[PDB]
C-alpha cells in the first residue's frame, strides 16, 4: 500500500478578527478589512474539500491564492493612502483633538486583532500582516495627532508621518512575498534544503545516484517529494524504497512520495544532472 | 536514462506591442499600459533560466505569475473607469469633435496591438486580453462621441456606454481566470482529462491498478505526470514502464514522469482510492 486540529484552529482564530472589524462600525478602511477576511476565510473552507478529478492534489493550495490576494489588497489600500497624503500635501488647507480619540480607539483595537494572531496556516500569516499593517497605518494619524495638537505651528508633519509609516507596511509585507513566490513557483520550501535531502537520502545502502529530484511544496506544511534513484542491480529494488519512505518519513513529514528506481543504465545529460545553483 | 523556437516567438510578438504604446505618446492610461508590458516581458526572460536548486522545476511557471498580474492590472484600470464614470455621472457638468479624432486615432491603433496577437504562450494569451480590453474600452468614448456629437440632447449616454463596455471587458477576462486558477492549484490542464489517461494507461499489459495518480501542469504546454502502478508480480517490472513512457510520450508530450511500480500488496483506503469528482 506504501502508506489534524490545525484546520479549525485558524477558523477559530480567524473568525474572531472578522467579527471585530464587523463590530467596528463606529465611523473605507474598515469596510475593506471586512471584505478581505470573509473571502480569505472562505478560502479556508476550500482546502477542506477532498481532492477532485479536476484538482488531483486537491484544494490545499487554494489557501495561498486567497492569502496572496489579501496581500495585494494591502498594497492597494496603502496605495490610496500615499496618493491622498500627496493630495493632503498639495492642498494644504485642512483643520484636532476631535481627530484623536476617534483614532485613540482605533490603535488599541488593532492590537487586539494583531495579538490574537500571535504566531501555522498561511492565511494566518497572511491575515496577520494585513492587520499589523492596518495597525501601523492607524498609529500614523494618532502619533501625528498627539504631535500637531501640541505643536500646530507645522501641521505638515502628518504627510511624512504616513510616508515613513507606509514603508513600515511594505517592508513588513515583503517577508511574506519572498515565500509565497516560492510556493507558486514549485520551489523547495523554507524548512528544507535541496542538498539537505540528497545526502540525507544518499546515506542509504542501495542508492547509487539520485537523479532528477523534484521537491516542491503545497501551502506551508504540505511537502511533496519525487525523484528517480539508481540501485544496485544485484540488490533487490522494491525493498530499498520500502525503507527510503521510512528513511524520509522518519526524517520529517510528507504528503506524497513517488520514487522511480531506475536501473544502472543511464546515459551519463543536463536534464538529470544537477541544479546549477 | 529513461529519457524550441516558441520561446522567442513571443519575444518577437510581444516586444512589438511594447513599442507601440511606447511610441503612443500623443496625450496616464498609456503609462499604465506601458508599466504592465515590460514587466510581463521581463517575466518571459525568467522562464529561460535553467532550473536552480531553490526552484527545482525551474522558472517555467514564473510566466503565469507575471501573466496573472497583467490581468489584475486590468481590473484596477477598469475599476477606476467605473468610479470616474460614476463621478462623471454625479457631476453632470462637462463639455465634442475635439474629443473624437483624439479617440479616432486610438481605436484603430488598438486593433494593431490586438491583431498582432492573433491566436501558445500564456503571456501571449495574457497580454492579448489586456489589449483587447483596452480596445473595447477605447471604442466606448469613440462610439459615444459619434453619438452625442450628432445627438447632444442627452449627453448622458456616455456613462452607460462605459458601463456596458466595462462588462465587455470583464466578461472577456474570466475565460483566462478559469484556466490560470487551475494551473496555480495543480489541477489537470485543459487539453487532457483525468480519466482520459487512466484508461489510456490501463490499456497496457502489466498494469493492474493505477493508484494515486497525480497530473498537474506547468504554464500552458508543460505537463508533468506522476503515479503509482501495480504490475503482475510474475511479470518483470522495469520493462513495463520502459514502455509506459513510450506509451504516454507517444500519446502526447510530457516534461517529467515518475512512476512507482508498487507491488501487488496494497491495503484495499481513501488516499489511493479515486477522486470523487
Ligand atoms: Zn492533500
Ligand atoms: Zn529517472
Ligand atoms: Zn538525464
Ligand atoms: Zn522545464
Ligand atoms: Zn503506490
Ligand atoms: Zn491508498
Numbering used by the authors:
A (entry chain B), B (entry chain A): 52 to 54, 64 to 87, 105 to 172, 175 to 198, 210 to 358, 361 to 369
Quote the original article.
ZnT8, one of the 10 ZnTs that have been identified so far, is localized in the insulin secretory granules of pancreatic β cells and responsible for the accumulation of high level of zinc inside granules, which is required for the packing of insulin in the hexameric form. ZnT8 functions as a Zn2+/H+ exchanger. The structure of HsZnT8 in the outward-facing state shows a ‘V’-shaped dimeric architecture similar to the crystal structure of EcYiiP, with the two TMDs forming the branches, whereas the two tightly packed CTDs located at the base of the ‘V’ and mediating the majority of the dimerization interactions. Our structural and functional analyses reveal a total of 4 Zn2+ binding sites in each subunit, including one primary site in the TMD (STM), one site at the interface between TMD and CTD (SIF), and two adjacent sites located in an open pocket of CTD covered by a HCH motif from the N-terminal segment of neighboring subunit (SCD1 and SCD2).
Volta phase plate was employed in data collection to enhance the contrast for better image alignment, and the initial data was collected using the wild-type HsZnT8 (HsZnT8-WT) sample prepared in the presence of Zn2+ (1 mM). The single particle reconstruction yielded a map of the transporter in an outward-facing conformation, but the overall resolution of 4.1 Å is insufficient for accurate model building. From the structure of HsZnT8-WT determined in the presence of Zn2+, we also observed cryo-EM density from a third Zn2+ ion coordinated by His137 and His345 at the interface between CTD and TMD, which is designated as SIF. Interestingly, SIF is positioned right at the cytosolic entrance to the Zn2+ transport pathway and mutation of the two SIF histidines resulted in marked reduction in Zn2+ transport rate. As the physiological function of ZnT8 is to transport Zn2+ ions from low concentration cytosol (free Zn2+ concentration:~1 nM) to high concentration granule (free Zn2+ concentration:~120 nM), we suspect SIF can help trap Zn2+ ions and effectively increase the local Zn2+ concentration, which in turn facilitate the ion transport against over 100-fold concentration gradient. STM is surrounded by His106, Asp110, His220 and Asp224 at the middle of the membrane and exposed to the luminal solution in the outward-facing structure. The density of a bound Zn2+ can be defined in the EM map of HsZnT8-WT. Although the side-chains of those ligand residues are not well defined in the map due to the resolution limit, their locations and conservation likely point to a classical tetrahedral coordination as observed in EcYiiP structure. In the outward-facing conformation, TMs 1–5 are tightly bundled at the cytosolic half of TMD, occluding the space between STM and the cytosol; at the luminal half of TMD, TMs 2–6 enclose a deep cavity, penetrating into the central STM where Zn2+ binds and providing a solvent accessible passageway from luminal side.
